[PDB]
Amino acid sequence: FILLKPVFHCLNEILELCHSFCSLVSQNLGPLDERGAGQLDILVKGFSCQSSLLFRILSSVRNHQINPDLAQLLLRLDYNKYY
Amino acid sequence: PREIITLQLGQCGNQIGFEFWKQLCAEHGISPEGIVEEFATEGTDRKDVFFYQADDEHYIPRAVLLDLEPRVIHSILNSPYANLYNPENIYLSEHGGGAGNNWASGFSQGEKIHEDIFDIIDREADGSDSLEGFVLCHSIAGGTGSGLGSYLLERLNDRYPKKLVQTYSVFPNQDEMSHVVVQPYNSLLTLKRLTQNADCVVVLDNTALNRIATDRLHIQNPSFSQINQLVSTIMSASTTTLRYPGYMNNDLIGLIASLIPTPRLHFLMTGYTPLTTDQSVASVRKTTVLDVMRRLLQPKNVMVSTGRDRQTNHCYIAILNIIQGEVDPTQVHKSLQRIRERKLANFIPWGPASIQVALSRKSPYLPSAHRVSGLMMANHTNISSLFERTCRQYDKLRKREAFLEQFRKEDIFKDNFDELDNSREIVQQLIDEYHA
Amino acid sequence: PREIITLQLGQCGNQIGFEFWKQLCAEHGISPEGIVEEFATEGTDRKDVFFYQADDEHYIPRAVLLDLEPRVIHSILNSPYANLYNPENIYLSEHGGGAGNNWASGFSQGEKIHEDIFDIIDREADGSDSLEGFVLCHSIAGGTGSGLGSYLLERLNDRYPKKLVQTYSVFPNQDEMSHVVVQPYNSLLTLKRLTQNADCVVVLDNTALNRIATDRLHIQNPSFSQINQLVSTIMSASTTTLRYPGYMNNDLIGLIASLIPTPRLHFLMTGYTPLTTDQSVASVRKTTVLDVMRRLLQPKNVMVSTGRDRQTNHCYIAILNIIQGEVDPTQVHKSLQRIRERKLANFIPWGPASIQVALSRKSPYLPSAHRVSGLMMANHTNISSLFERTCRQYDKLRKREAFLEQFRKEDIFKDNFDELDNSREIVQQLIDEYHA
């Protein structure tokens, strides 16, 4: 549930933004279309809208008076991310 | 559902798949001719993922075995595990082949038995309406497994385009070149088909087999009867998430998707430590999971002949560490805690890396529910040392005028030798370029 | 972490290190073949600093033992403490050597077994990723320990440049010159390597051994079986801050850093009082720490043959006074209070001096947790009297035409005799210049 408003809104924004990466690739010969690169350009913003919002929670995980089981899990994926 | 058809082919590919099916009955609690134990459904929660689904609780193997040599199949029917195999799915009694030892033999025999080779192996395809893919359990050594195996990598690419292809192919031996001399020719012709006409491979070196076969196994005369023991366990080890009930990467398109960086970079390093039976007397004292993955990244269990001083400029990108059976999962995150402190895997400087660990319960059996098992599926960029070894043995042979007049009489009119040389160097250059 | 590899070498260096490892099991509460006592972890808080770290709670010694003479190693395997040693780390059964008695023998044998001498001793180096250094537990007497030991002081200086080097080397005996006559030649050749190719030494005189061996030990015929008793205790005494849990100078690069004034001035005087077993019956009445360091600076426990009337123009610069076990630390500052009133150490007039005292708890054992122990590591500038003794015995021998034709047939073409003479006088002149 990790956090009530932001992280659950950050997490469902992750699964929405890669869901249009399904519907972009699913065209016939995707990466050679002008609409294949035109729909893409919005998604290259929204993917780093999600890693940078994941970056914003990690500063609340280091500057820490919130929750230990929140912090142990989200850093476990984060050294599995940044390493 | 998730049905895979194994394509056992060649002189060595048929024997490594014969004990692969023989390994599966001892862990499913079943007999090849009957069902005498009730441990098959209460202990094992899924059995119809490599076998054909049952008609009389007789789990038929979804296997086909073609070879030019009849010697490998005549050592099968006298064994009591051949009644599980069917004499109508592949061949009836007295099946034969060529004479025969050539790469151009099986490459030319594919289009003269083209009607029969695409008739009975397609009957098992429409048994399940959602086919997983095809694994070519073939060989690179000799001209039998390398000649005919290059043909099916082309015609099954377009007739079945939406299916996973990935092979457990064994590499030949490069110790001396007296009995066989055609080894640099038939290997590189299949190795081109393994990168562009095939998605992934699982490499299995032969010079690294006797490194392990004299390490802990203590033999004096190396025979062919030991080549099936290291190979059949890691085959069943690779499907423990797929056969036994797992959750994540429980399909064959689950495991291979999380390890391949790019096409033509798919050569996965394999490791497997526990092969000794006298370890059993000291695993009663709770031998933990904290010590079993410290030796996987340590180059001791590897089955790939690579350089020891070439790992400083090469970087791991994807490493798999599969624990099986008793795991004690309250310390499996504790084992992954100690990975970042050593940095035994060199990490790519351009992007992130990943150490993926997974578990699944083993068979209800006493040597399986007691001893910890570790299966490694690495991906390190020092694999070009084998490609530098094969290419240096390839261009040196063409300057000695070896098999240029003895090889182009049948079905070869143009020089396709540099077609294999540049595409091999394309693999070797894009590997070193991949870490920017 | 803080792993040190001991380099036991020579006829005398192997025997003084054999009982050094035998001393360590009696204080760790462990047996060389098993673990029968639980006192190893509750009483001792650190054990993996000289031993190799455990695989089955079997603390392997991090030791290598090479010698040309097979007699020193054939008196080892029949003793029950040799099963703790491994027959694969150094040598297997039936190891040999030269003929052999020459300084030029082992100096020329280092580059013909150059491949094997840098192969198995480097396997213990990468066991820990932070290596402390190397201690050369070798000898100066004879041509066995002095011939080969001068070679490893050169090639380990650049292959391992960031490691501490410091040796516990024993000095030979200068009573008569009948059995050996090559004693001034092989000693000064190694003594040059001990100053510029080595950072620090720990001197151990032989003529000062029988001064103590007849002082309180009461023997009539001096044998070689007493040379291992004074040496093995002060070796384990020097690592009491390193083996047992201490706080300050708990590393080997901690102790040596606070005593060396400058390079080529590193010869440390050693002292150790308690060696008598009938003192035990009167230590029950709270024998204090106020009387044990009054006799350390008094020249009674010294192991260095020096002049008695040459201490007025020489000055102490660094003096170490190590108390062990029961200290009663409420009066250890009281013992250091009485040092300035006597001024038993002459202080350097150019700079400050230092009397460093430290403590660590001893083994949970009855002769160790009852009797006070004092280990001295002095540094006094009267050590040139030994260098004046060795040099006066060196130039007198070259005028008698002794071993100038019998020594330059093998691997010696130029006169390197004055190369050792001037560098020895450089040490002797910079010592007296050091107090301005």
Place this chain on the structure above:
Amino acid sequence: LDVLNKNYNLLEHMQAMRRYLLLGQGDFIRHLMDLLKPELVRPATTLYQHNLTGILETAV
């Protein structure tokens, strides 16, 4: 004073805090401070805490 000895070890924690905050036993802190220096030489970031928790756990 007997209920702490059976369950909580109260004044045993009086001795245990001396080994870390007062730095009684140095081998716990020296094997710490050896590994701990390649992280302290760089300026701290928001990525600082996550490897400091198990540079402790490899030290203990």
